[PDB]
Design a protein around this ligand. Structure first.
Ligand SMILES: Cc1cc2nc3c(=O)[nH]c(=O)nc-3n(C[C@H](O)[C@H](O)[C@H](O)COP(=O)(O)OP(=O)(O)OC[C@H]3O[C@@H](n4cnc5c(N)ncnc54)[C@H](O)[C@@H]3O)c2cc1C
Ligand SMILES: C/C=C/CC/C=C/CC/C=C/CCCCCCC(=O)OC[C@H](COP(=O)(O)OCCN)OC(=O)CCCCCCC/C=C/C/C=C/CCC
Ligand code: HEM
Ligand SMILES: O=C(Nc1cccc(-c2ccccc2)c1)c1ccccc1C(F)(F)F
Ligand code: SF4
Ligand code: F3S
Ligand code: FES
Lengths: 152, 129, 616, 250
């Protein structure tokens, strides 16, 4: 149940349709900027996790396969440690970035930090702390396993 | 020559003609508050679950994430599931499929925690690679 | 309409306004409020009209800064006109000034404020307290540096509340004339290429000026004098065209205006010597002298080799001696504009400025009630029934030979409202909406088609570019009888090249090639009349100076005491309105002259102000 | 001679079965003004008169000449041409709007929506229209700074993705910031009912704080903040102060 303008607004679309007027390009022409790439990312990550959780939760339930045989399987492939800690970085960074940038957006929702510098710092600080935290969570235990391997 | 039709006023919005019989929509305001508050309260939860694992955590993530991602995808569906490009009922199908996505997310999660390692234990094991 | 087919559409309104500037809207507001079925026809969205680009402000004796009397405003208004001003219309204006501007504030216009919480007023050119004897006045209400933007936006908003049905991006073509009566307008809707006739009881013309008749100006690209061209084609003589106002501080390279408000805050003009030279040309008022006095002052310093810059061919406006706080709070707009176009930090350098075309006190002659008129020697003032006009496009005449700063936005809101009031009361619900004569607008369409398809050998940009250049050279700040004579000659030749015109875009739908060519006919009408009217005025009054006729020619000589002389005949002196009448097809013009209404509206309320020497 | 090139989006709705196109144009930079509008005019006058675009004020105040230059939504008239003649500047119209011709977008929803916030002053106690000024302090009216200077150019509405996808329901940055300017106006008694027409989850809540609006605005204003501000009120995390009381000697 719409507002009167939202009704008017619909009928307007129908008119512009009827006249067969083109729609001026947008994604394909608009300059990449920190403002909307970050938002883009914030969504892309948020959704992919949900996606993973649905493809994950429903996937192992509807298959005879379980999680232990899956982890078992890929260790069996004997794949370099560097590549495997990259795949860990790619799992952490989504959760790290989305959560940090979540607070940022809760800021912007309350008018806090909406000037053009606060937008551009808030952006780098978040990509920073999120990449920092995702390396710190991948390389720390990998540096604490190269101690058991090689130390007394 | 000028042997022509009597034409009409162009389409044009009257914000006073609009104000007769219009009754305000139930306010979305209260809801927007709890969506965000809820997200704010999950800010400590993610780091909590880094340190503390096990079955009580697995359960509190699944409950929280579901309810958060329920409101997430509802907003993402309302953005890309537009009548002007899908037609009316296909767009409504996508709105319904949002509530399906929410209730299959949970079932699969609940399943995963009750008949498999759980969310935390699952992360442990890929970090043990 | 030979070489093509044209959809046409008929409407039926109580009154059709041609304009969505300050005047137009304010009129339309009045009319809808009073339950008329009003149409507003405008060639662009109303927010885009020139009013939006006004900076300085709007005059009213509010006494928000120091006690004021609307009669001192009335004084300055007439002095500024140089006694060409019809004092009745100046009376109406200044009297209703305080109400008009208060209405705006009540409409939600976000004015700048004082510590007491009232409307902030700034000093501005040409004005003074106690009938020229007091100091420098302070009655120029403003929204900082963006007073027109704010007034138009406010006006536009309030027009949506009062049920005017808007016909936007409709190019008005001609008035619909039924043997001396105005029954409507014919227009080309740009969106869909159709042609629209509007039938109406009244018609208000509110179409702004013709600054694009010159190579340099402060005006918008749309300022092409379509309304005066509308009236010319409808067989109505225009008035006072030869008074083109040159604003002193337009930016040098570009034209963009720097407000007079920049001088009203404290800024001043400076030559190559570093002299604040206005103290020579006007010891009392200095840089706040009337615009024409200042513009000439600048134009001399240039001619006498004290111009500033590489060519020594412009002047500096100095603002960096003021506080930075005050430059942000009072002049944020031009602070920015100077930055963008001149590459100047106004807090650290001067802005290069030069006298620039700006306003047209000429226009469609009316009465004090805003009813468009005709004039013959014998019959006199003869109104044109159904027709009204207001704003830059009109000649009430409240500015005579020199516009007072901050008096156009007033003229627009006062006489805009005056059209609505003066129609609510002569139009009564008995009178039904006129029917159109057969063949109505047929020739407008014939012209349209001829221009649209035309294949001459001179393109529509080139013919314009010289019309503008001819005007800058021959009809500028200082004029001489031989230069003007050659001007008229060269100009009358360009009126013939209009048959050899070349257009390319053949479309009906949003053809900005075709519409800029209708503008060029409309300019040529206005331009040719401006230069002949000027070439014939052998005096020097207000914003019109002849080198070869440097004195002001009035009935008496007002430099000596009065009693003792004999009043010169009307044919000998020049205190009178020039009336150009042009034949649209042949381009031939004829002249005639109209007496200045010296009486006020109400002798009781205020006495008329007899002419004196005009020195600031 | 420095010959700069422009790829300009073109479309004509009279050619049957028409399609949008890019057209290259070469322009001598030393025969031409500094700003991008100067080039469009030059090209229209000397090369292709069909080339259709809006303009009026030359000083960046009207908002007629809004378009997408070099990726960003800005006004052409205060847009300095990139003199690096190796690259080519791309000029499309305001994104995602139905086009009428070339660089001219049908701006009619944008206007209708501006009408729908009711952009005018509303009073509970019928005022006598010409009689006296309404009190407002400096501080009260400086709330209006950053807000009343909107020229209605639509750069920002046309840069917001949400508004691309949902122009019909979401009012968008420019109309919303204007909505807020009639809400924090101390002189406006209708703060209450104004928020009632953006209660729904689409009118104002479809702002997903992307921040494209504040970034692109050629007048250096900020809608993203005004929108953020509009929510609280909607949430009730905030309310509008009552007017400062008008002194009795006024
Ligand atoms: C840069 C600048 C600054 C100024 N500053 C001030 C100031 O501080 N104070 C002051 O008092 N005055 C100022 N003026 C003068 C004043 O702003 C204008 O003279 C006044 O705004 C004119 O109002 P108007 O409604 O008559 O015409 P405009 O406001 O010029 O509007 C003209 C309207 O007529 C319409 N129109 C034109 N031709 C056609 C056609 N063929 N068909 C349909 N519609 C048409 C246009 O579309 C537009 O809607 C300034 C002028 C300029 C140029
Ligand atoms: C596409 C990819 C999709 C992935 C699935 C999406 C799932 C999302 C829900 C995530 C729930 C939190 C996970 C944390 C966790 O299980 O423990 C750490 C674990 C290691 O086990 P382990 O190896 O057993 O860990 C060592 C034992 N402690 O997993 C991690 O390494 C994740 C790191 C978490 C980063 C924290 C974010 C930063 C937050 C900052 C907040 C700031 C202020 C408040
Ligand atoms: C831990 C703290 C978290 C916070 C503070 C948070 C905050 C937010 C916020 C504010 C939004 C809405 C932004 C917008 O409207 O554009 C959002 C959207 C979303 N979040 Fe979260 N989130 C968190 C964790 C998660 C997690 C763990 C998931 C896991 C799947 C997730 C999935 C989503 C999804 C799918 C959206 C979709 C809506 C959109 O992108 O616009 N979020 N989040
Ligand atoms: O659509 C969104 N980003 C999007 C989606 C698709 C393309 C582009 C895009 C691409 C290029 C330039 C500009 C925008 C941007 C988006 C992202 C986060 C929150 C809300 C939204 C939206 F409201 F639905 F618009
Ligand atoms: S906000 Fe900036 S961009 Fe959006 S309209 Fe007002 S001015 Fe144009
Ligand atoms: S670009 Fe778009 S969604 Fe909100 S904050 Fe800015 S409007
Ligand atoms: S035409 Fe006024 S914004 Fe450039």
């Amino acid at each position: 149940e719409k507002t009167p303008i939202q009704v008017w607004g619909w009928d307007y679309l129908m008119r512009q349709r009827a006249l067969k007027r083109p729609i001026a390009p947008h994604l394909t022409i608009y300059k990449p900027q920190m403002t909307w790439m970050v938002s883009g990312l914030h969504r892309v990550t948020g959704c992919a996790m949900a996606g993973t959780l649905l493809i994950g939760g429903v996937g192992f339930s509807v298959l005879p396969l379980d999680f232990t045989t899956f982890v078992e399987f890929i260790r069996g492939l004997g794949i370099p440690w560097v590549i495997l800690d990259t795949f860990k970085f790619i799992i952490a960074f989504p959760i790290a970035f989305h959560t940090l940038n979540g607070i940022r957006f809760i800021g912007f929702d309350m008018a806090k930090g909406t000037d053009i510098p606060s937008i551009y710092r808030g952006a780098y600080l978040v990509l920073g702390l999120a990449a920092l935290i995702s390396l710190a969570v991948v390389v720390y235990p990998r540096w604490e396993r190269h101690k058991k391997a090689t130390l007394p | 020559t000028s042997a022509a039709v009597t034409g009409a006023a162009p389409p044009q919005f009257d914000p006073i003609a609009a104000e007769k019989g219009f009754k305000p929509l139930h306010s979305h305001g209260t809801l927007f508050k709890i969506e965000r508050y809820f997200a704010a309260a999950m800010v400590p939860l993610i780091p909590a679950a880094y340190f503390i694992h096990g079955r009580e955590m697995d359960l509190c993530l699944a409950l929280a994430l579901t309810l958060h991602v329920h409101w997430g995808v509802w907003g993402v569906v309302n953005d890309y599931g537009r009548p002007f490009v899908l037609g009316d009922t296909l767009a409504a199908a996508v709105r319904v499929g949002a509530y399906i996505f929410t209730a299959c997310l949970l079932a699969g999660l609940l399943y995963f925690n009750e008949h498999d390692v759980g969310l935390t234990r699952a992360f442990e094991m890929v970090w043990e690679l | 309409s030979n070489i093509a087919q044209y959809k046409v559409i008929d409407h039926a309104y109580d009154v059709v306004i041609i304009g969505a500037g300050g005047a137009g809207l304010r009129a339309a507001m009045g009319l809808g409020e009073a339950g008329f079925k009003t149409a507003v026809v405008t060639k662009m969205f109303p927010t885009r009209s020139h009013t939006t680009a006004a900076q300085g402000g709007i005059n009213a004796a509010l006494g928000s800064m120091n006690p004021d009397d609307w009669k001192w405003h009335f004084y300055d208004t007439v002095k500024g006109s140089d006694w060409l001003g019809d004092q009745n219309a100046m009376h109406y204006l200044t009297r209703n000034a305080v109400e008009a501007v208060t209405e705006l504030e009540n409409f939600g216009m976000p004015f700048s404020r004082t510590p007491e919480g009232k409307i902030y007023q700034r000093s501005f050119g040409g004005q003074s307290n106690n009938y020229g004897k007091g100091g420098v006045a302070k009655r120029t209400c403003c929204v900082a540096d963006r007073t027109g933007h704010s007034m138009l936006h406010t006006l536009y908003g309030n027009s949506l509340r009062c049920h005017c049905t808007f016909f936007i991006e409709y190019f008005a073509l001609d008035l619909l004339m039924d043997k001396g009566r105005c029954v409507g307008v014919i227009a080309l809707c740009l969106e869909d290429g159709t042609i629209h006739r509007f039938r109406s009881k009244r018609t208000i013309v509110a179409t702004g000026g013709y600054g694009r008749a010159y190579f340099s100006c402060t005006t918008a690209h749309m300022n092409t004098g379509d309304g005066t061209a509308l009236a010319t084609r409808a067989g109505i003589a225009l008035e006072d065209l030869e008074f083109i106002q040159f604003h002193p501080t337009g930016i040098y390279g570009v034209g963009c205006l720097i407000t007079e408000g920049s001088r009203g805050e404290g800024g001043f003009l400076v030559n190559s010597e570093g002299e604040r030279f206005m103290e020579r040309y006007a010891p009392k008022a200095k840089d706040l002298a009337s615009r024409d006095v200042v513009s000439r002052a600048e134009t001399i310093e240039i001619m006498e080799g004290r111009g500033v810059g590489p060519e020594k061919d412009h002047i500096y406006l100095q603002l960096h001696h003021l506080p930075a706080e005050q430059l942000h709070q009072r002049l944020p707009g031009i602070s920015e504009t100077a930055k963008i176009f001149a590459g100047v930090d106004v807090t650290k350098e001067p802005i290069p400025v030069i006298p620039t075309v700006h306003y047209n006190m000429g226009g469609i002659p009316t009465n004090y009630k805003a009813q468009v008129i005709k004039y013959t020697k014998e019959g006199g003032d003869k109104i044109v029934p159904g027709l009204y006009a207001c704003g830059e496009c009109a000649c009430h005449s409240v500015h005579g030979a020199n516009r007072l700063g901050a008096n156009s936005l007033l003229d627009a809101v006062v006489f805009g409202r005056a059209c609505s009031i003066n129609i609510k009361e002569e139009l009564k619900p008995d009178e039904k909406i006129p029917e159109l004569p057969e063949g109505a607008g047929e020739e407008s369409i014939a012209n349209l088609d001829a221009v649209r398809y035309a294949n001459g050998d001179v393109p529509t940009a080139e013919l314009r570019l010289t019309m503008q250049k001819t005007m800058q050279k021959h009809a500028g700040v200082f004029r001489r009888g031989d230069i003007l004579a050659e001007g008229v000659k060269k100009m009358m030749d360009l009126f013939k090249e209009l048959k050899r015109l070349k257009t390319t875009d053949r479309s009906l739908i949003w053809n900005s090639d075709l519409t800029e060519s209708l503008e060029l006919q409309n300019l040529m009408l206005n331009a040719t009349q401006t230069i002949v009217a000027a070439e014939n005025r052998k005096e020097s009054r207000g914003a019109h100076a002849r080198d070869d006729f440097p004195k002001r020619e009035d009935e008496y000589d007002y430099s000596k005491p009065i009693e003792g002389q004999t009043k010169r005949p009307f044919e000998k002196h020049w205190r009178k309105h020039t009336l150009t009448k042009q034949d649209p097809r042949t381009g031939h013009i004829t002249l005639d002259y109209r007496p200045v209404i010296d009486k006020t509206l109400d002798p009781a309320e205020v006495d008329w102000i007899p002419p004196i020497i005009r020195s600031y | 001679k420095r010959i700069k090139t422009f790829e300009i989006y073109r479309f004509n709705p009279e050619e049957p079965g028409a399609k949008p196109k890019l057209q290259k144009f070469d322009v001598d930079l030393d025969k031409c003004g500094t700003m991008v509008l100067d080039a469009l005019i030059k090209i229209k006058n000397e090369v292709d008169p069909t080339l259709t675009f809006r303009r009026s004020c030359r000083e960046g105040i009207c908002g007629s000449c809004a378009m997408n230059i070099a990726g960003e939504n800005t006004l052409a008239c205060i847009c300095n041409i990139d003199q690096n003649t190796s690259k080519t500047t791309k000029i499309y119209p305001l994104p995602h709007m139905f086009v009428i011709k070339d660089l001219v977008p049908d701006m009619n929803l944008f206007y209708a929506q501006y009408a729908s916030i009711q952009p005018w002053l509303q009073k509970k106690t019928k005022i006598n229209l010409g009689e006296k000024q309404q009190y407002q302090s400096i501080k009260e009216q400086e709330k209006l700074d950053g807000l009343y200077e909107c020229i209605l150019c639509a750069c920002c509405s046309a840069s917001c993705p949400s508004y691309w996808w949902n122009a019909d329901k979401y009012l968008g940055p420019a109309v919303l910031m204007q909505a807020y300017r009639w809400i924090i106006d101390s002189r406006d008694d209708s703060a209450a009912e104004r928020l009632a027409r953006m209660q729904d989850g689409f009118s104002a809540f479809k702002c997903h704080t992307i921040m494209n609006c504040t970034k692109t605005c050629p007048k250096h204003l900020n809608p993203a903040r005004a929108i953020g501000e509009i929510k609280m009120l909607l949430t009730k995390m905030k309310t509008k102060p009552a007017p400062l009381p008008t002194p009795a000697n006024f």
